[PDB]
Design a protein around this nucleic acid. Sequence first.
RNA 1: ACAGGGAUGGCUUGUGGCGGCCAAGCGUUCAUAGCGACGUCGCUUUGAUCCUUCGAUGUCGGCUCUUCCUAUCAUACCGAAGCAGAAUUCGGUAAGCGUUGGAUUGUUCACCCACUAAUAGGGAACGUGAGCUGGGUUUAGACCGUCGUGAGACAGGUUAGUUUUACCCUACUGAUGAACUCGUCGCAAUGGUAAUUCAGCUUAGUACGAGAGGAACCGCUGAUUCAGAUAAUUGGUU
RNA 2: AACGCGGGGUUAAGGUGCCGGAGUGGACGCUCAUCAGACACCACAAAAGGCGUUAGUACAUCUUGACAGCAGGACGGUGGCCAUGGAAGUCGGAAUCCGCUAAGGACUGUGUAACAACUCACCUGCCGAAUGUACUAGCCCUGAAAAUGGAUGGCGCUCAAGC
Lengths: 97, 67, 190, 254, 237, 79, 135, 169
Amino acid sequence: SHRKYEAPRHGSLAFLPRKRAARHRGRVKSFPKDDPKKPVHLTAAMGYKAGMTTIVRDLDRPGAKAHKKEVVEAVTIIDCPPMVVVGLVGYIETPRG
Amino acid sequence: PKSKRARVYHLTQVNKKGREAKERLFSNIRETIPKYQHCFVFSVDNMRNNYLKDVRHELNDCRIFFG
Amino acid sequence: MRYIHSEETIPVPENVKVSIKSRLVTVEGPRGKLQKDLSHIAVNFSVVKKGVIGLEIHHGSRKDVAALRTVRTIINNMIIGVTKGFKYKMRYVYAHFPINVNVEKNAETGCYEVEIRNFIGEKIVRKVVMAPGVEVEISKAQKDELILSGNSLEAVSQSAADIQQICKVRNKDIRKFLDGIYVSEKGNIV
Amino acid sequence: TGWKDIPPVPTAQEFIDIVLSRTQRRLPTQIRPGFKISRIRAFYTRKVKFTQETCSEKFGAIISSFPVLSDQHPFHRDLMNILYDADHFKVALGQISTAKNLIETISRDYVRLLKYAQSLYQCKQLKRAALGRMATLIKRLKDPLIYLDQVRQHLARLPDINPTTRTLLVAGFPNVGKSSFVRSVTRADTPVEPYAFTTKSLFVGHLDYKYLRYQVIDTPGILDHPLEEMNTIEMQSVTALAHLRAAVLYFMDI
Amino acid sequence: PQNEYIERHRKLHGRRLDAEERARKKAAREGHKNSENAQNLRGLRAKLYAKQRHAQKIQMRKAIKQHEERNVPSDPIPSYLLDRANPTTAARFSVPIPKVRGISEEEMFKVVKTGKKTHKKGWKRIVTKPTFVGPDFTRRPVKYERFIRPMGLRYKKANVTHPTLNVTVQLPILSVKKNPSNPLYTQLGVLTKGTIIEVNVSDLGIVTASGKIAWGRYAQITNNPENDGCVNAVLLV
Amino acid sequence: AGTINKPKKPTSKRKTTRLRAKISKRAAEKKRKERKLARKNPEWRSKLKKDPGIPNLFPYKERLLQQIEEERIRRKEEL
Amino acid sequence: KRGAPGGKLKMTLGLPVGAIMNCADNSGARNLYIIAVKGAGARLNRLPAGGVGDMVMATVKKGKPELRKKVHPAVIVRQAKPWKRFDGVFLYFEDNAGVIVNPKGEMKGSAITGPVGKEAAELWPRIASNAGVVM
Amino acid sequence: EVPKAVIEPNRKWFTNTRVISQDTLQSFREAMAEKQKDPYTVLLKSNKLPMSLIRDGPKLEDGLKKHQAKMTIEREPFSETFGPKAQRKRPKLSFNTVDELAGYSEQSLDSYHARLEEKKLLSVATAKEAIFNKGTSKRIWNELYKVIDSSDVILHVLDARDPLGTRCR
RNA sequence: ACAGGGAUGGCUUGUGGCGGCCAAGCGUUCAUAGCGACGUCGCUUUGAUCCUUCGAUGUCGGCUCUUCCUAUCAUACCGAAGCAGAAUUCGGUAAGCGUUGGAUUGUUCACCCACUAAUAGGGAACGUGAGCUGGGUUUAGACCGUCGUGAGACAGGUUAGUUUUACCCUACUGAUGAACUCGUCGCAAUGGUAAUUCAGCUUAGUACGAGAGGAACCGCUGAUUCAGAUAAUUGGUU
RNA sequence: AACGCGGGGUUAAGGUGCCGGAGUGGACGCUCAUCAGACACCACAAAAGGCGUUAGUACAUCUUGACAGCAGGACGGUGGCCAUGGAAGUCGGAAUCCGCUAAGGACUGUGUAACAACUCACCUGCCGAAUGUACUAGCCCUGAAAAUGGAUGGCGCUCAAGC
Ligand SMILES: [Mg+2]
């Protein structure tokens, strides 16, 4: 028989299985779509999370109630020493990917 | 042919004439032939021809067929 | 019941060149060239006489015999398009907010673009891109009239249909709100 | 305010189709003979009660939406009599209420019988009997429903006339310039034409004089004969002249 | 806006410029649309659609026949009865229904169980058909009420038809004379099909040959009241 | 309908033994009951059925009618 | 228009249904017992709750007898549960309090006793006009 | 066991079971007119009589008002009154002259103001508590009708401090 | 107490029955009977009354949680309606996404109240049946009512009262892992899949409207429900 | 179709596209299904609904020109009678005839406050040869369905591997 009171489901099925990641470094699953008319650029970088802190921001957001006012916001600091480029991988396109 | 234009039935008084109109026209012409001295043939080409009513009224002693 | 033989004929004017190969019809006239692929319909094309194109179907059903009439009208409309052309006049009418129609020609794509502003006071700008080969002008003889001309009847009529469909009144009584762009006349350029 | 908020009045067959489609589609329809008799009784009882409740809701909406002639200002009450024949009006609404009450009685009787039914076939026959009797009762209402829908549309298009404010009421024979005057002093779209009885209804416009709102009432013309010889068009003007405390502007063309 | 404002708007401004062409084209597409609905609708909507189309075809054929035949009361009544709604009006002493389906006692009575234990007593029987209890009826006390005739199943009136006069009148039931299945069913007064009941015929205006007023006659029940929710009877005349 | 993009539960054409047996029994019962109403049918039936005749599009209907009339004349002369 | 005001940033809701708050106007009521909150969504088992600047529906438990038999709209003007504003300030009042209004937002009384919140004063201009202290 | 449910042919099915004469009817009508009510007498067994021929007819105004609606609809159908095919031209008026109309308007306005004052003399409110519905339950009234159906004598008990208050008419 | 035996179904759905008449058609034309859809006609308060509630043999629930059906309440799109505008009504495609918080047990617990976009209906049990816990419900104690001379039974009413796994197999959720040398960087078959609804500013007091009233596309800003993270700050926790 | 254990031959019912032994066998047709059909007969279900597709039957029109169109006519008594504030074929009620006719209703619809205006029935001209109506028989679609994902046994099959 039917459920008398409707309630939405606990949790999302888009994040299954709820298992440990297979690697510790995060994997870039998708890169931005390449446009040959744009200039050459790198699409990603690496860093190390240092922690969080607090700021005060002067807000220019027309329409918002906090327009032309100071807002207190949390931020995350990522320590980013420069990376070193040491390689080059080429990819061909096949009917298997 | 199942696919077919549907014919509308006319819920009006006047029906189609048929062969009886043709026989009546034949009899009228063949009985008006001996009563008159002359028979003229006239033409009205690409005309509205609604003034033949006035022509019939003006020539009341004649007989006009426009069949 | 299968009919042994069925035939249609298309007369061709003196200034029109028609070439058919593998059921791909190419018709050229004083105004340009039209092309259409008719390979979806089984038909035997031939030259039964000087200036006459013959269409035949052999051992066909009633539906197969009937498709030749559509092919005949299509090729005839192509011949009319390259000889006289096709012209659709549209009229835009309004009650309170004047409809502003701007016609541009895109140099990159070669197609015309029609922009409609202030339709019942709406702030959106409606943009319709014409099919290639369709020329759009704003008439100077009459008031609030667009003229769409071309060689392809399907292209001209579908472009006029697009302009008619994009200016649609929604959630209003259409006995009261009469605003829109409507096809007012259909005919030939010449 | 006006009477534009009356919901539409369906015909008898439309009413039947609406009610039975709601019963068909808003309730489960599959019941099995192998189930328990209490379950089968509950299924058919729910069908009967829901059909009655839909009928009662629609009938109550019709009854409570239409104006009550006893509670109106005498101008509005007599105008509604002139336009719609208060006798026919009240008879139609009384028939609607009587059919609503009879449908509720039928529902109670067949629920009481379904308490004692002993098989799915008997329960099914009792449900069909109940719904068929409701359908016959609704089908007996064909002429009142058509009349009430016409009255509803006319009432929705009536002008809004406040009987207790500043008002200038224009009267006279036809073709003397009443509509021309009302057009010249107000914004009302009342037609001006050279033939008699161009205006067949009460029109109303508004104006401002010394920061006060005045309403101006254009009427159909009146002829010179006693009241028993006047048609409804002239009696609109007569009712306006009789029941509205106004400034009467009697127009003559010399 | 006031009065016929949409009509005035049509008179002053017209309609939309394509309204006539759109209406003509939709009417022209109606034939294809009707065949598509006949071949593509499903379920109850399709069944109701088909019954409606059947009705319109019948009415159209009737109108066609009337237009073909354009070019071509019953009982004597007095003048004061003219133009009124009059009824149409159409040894072995056998009733119209001499045999019906017999009702067994298991179908007639259900067992009413009593007691607080798991094993119940089962002596009380409830009558599952409509009954007539008669005037001055007081129910037996519960300790001695073997047969239970519930109040929601008791009837007092019946729709009785006079076969000669062709008139159906709602009459009071006077008694139950003979239930064809069982004398016990007669004694309990069960109203089932084929039952002879006594009805009050005062509203029918029946006068005997001696001038006395007949106010009680026999009718036979011609329907199934337990399935019907009403009693339908035919006078035995 | 959205049948192509989102089809529903299929209507199975696989029969069950119980339903096949029940349908066979019901068909046999209907045949016997129809025989019973046929043997107690009170509807009138003609001794001789209405014969359709000769089709019009048969090209030799006229000479066949000539043959019929000639056969009638010969039978009348013989009798 | 329903009673929920527009342009309100998210704050902590300290007053669920069943809370009794003070009455901060001179309408005659002393306390307001919350029975519903305007704009509360649908969630299984979740009590509807209101914060400062919200319109709730309330009955009067203590006050004049004519007010005791009706359901009045009220606006919460003070709450004791601490909440954060966009300027980073966490703050709270020493009591929970509201004022009786109509559905359009005009006050039933004529004066407000004690301060009101900035959220309440900004969302309801009549409360802003009858507030002696805005905090 | 399924019995044979058969009705025999009998001449008694086609006769009159109960007959009454005009003298007997007239005597019963006189008794009906003469009957009075005595609280100290009780009815023990009703006489089976054709009461429709014995009791007096409905009142004159009731007999007219039960058929006024049907009579008006027979005189004027709904389709001829209002609608696209309506043929109604003269309205029905309760006045005949202009002076009568003026007086009628005055009395109508006075009565309308009187009704408005009466209605004025006579934030939404909270719902009534369900404790005050007690005594009106379907189960309780099923019990009441069961007791009434089973009882011959009914003792209706009244509080001496509020008899008409506790009386159940 | 003992010995044993047990625990209607390709059903259903939206439009009553009885009686009469009409009836295209089916039959019949050595009998003019009999069937008969569509219909129709008879029985079953001038918007009233509120002083007529008509029988438990059949038992339902609540909590938690997942999924499906569509017979759609809301959201999206569309057709029609005197649909001016606003608000709607009827209908169509559509199950993607939601569908709540309470009062009332002197009772078929079903009806009220509010919020809300909306507070739609069902199945997977009830075509017998080990999750937890309230009622039909009923071992032994006890009392009142009815019946019986009585043991006792019941039309009944009340009170108190013993089943207490999991470590097994499968399934499910996670965690390791042999064989291919160890490692780093990758691809992506297949499986899962995610957002939702409201409000405010502007358009605009504009279109429309006699008046009262009164939108929408584009643009902008918040909030509801859901989901995934996080701990700078504020609370809680020691 | 009846039975000891074996070998060889031939069949029955059923089958021969693959699973699967045996034919993508032959002839003439029919049918395209938005979950066809392939073991149906019973029910849903009816004299049922289809502008699906073929085969027939009956009646009718047709070079004295049929069916479809296009160009034109569609008139006079007469604004027929009663009624209506108004009502002229076209809000209603009842009648519904004559003339001129080649033909044209005291009018089939749109329209007007009422007229006007347009349109239909019917007639003529242009054209050019076969059609129209209703029934019958086949095959196809609809003719009511719930709830885990599934079943002509499965793949799959469209001048079939369906009938
Ligand atoms: Mg005038």
